[PDB]
Amino acid sequence: GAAWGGSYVNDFIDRGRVKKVYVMSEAKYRMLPDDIGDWYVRAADGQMVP
Amino acid sequence: ATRAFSQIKDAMVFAFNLPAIVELGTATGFDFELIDQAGLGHEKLTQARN
């Protein structure tokens, strides 16, 4: 969800105004279906599972 | 009371009567708002107020 759709984490202060903070994948890593193979998840043992 | 309390040190003590209409409060002078319109900050607004 965070990689392909973005995630609203919390707020920050831009020039004295409260504004959102978003984490999302860089454009070129969430364009084509094959890009799904670029993402890994850490396992309980620390291994990276595709 | 104000004359007597003017001698008090380390404190500003001021005695005063109620406004005729407490809901409106005082109508003696003016109320002025200095607004930070360009995101200057608290310090710059303080300098402008000074």
From Swiss-Prot, chain B:
Disruption phenotype: Loss of susceptibility to contact-dependent growth inhibition (CDI); inhibiting cells still contact the target. Induction: Positively regulated by MarA, Rob and SoxS transcriptional regulators (at protein level). It is found in: Cell inner membrane. Signal peptide: none annotated. Belongs to the resistance-nodulation-cell division (RND) (TC 2.A.6) family. Homotrimer, with large domains that extend into the periplasm, interacts with AcrA and TolC. AcrA may be required to stably link this protein and TolC. Interacts with AcrZ. Part of the AcrA-AcrB-AcrZ-TolC efflux pump. AcrA-AcrB-AcrZ-TolC is a drug efflux protein complex with broad substrate specificity that uses the proton motive force to export substrates. This is Multidrug efflux pump subunit AcrB. The gene is acrB. The chain holds residues 651 to 700 of 1049 of the full protein.
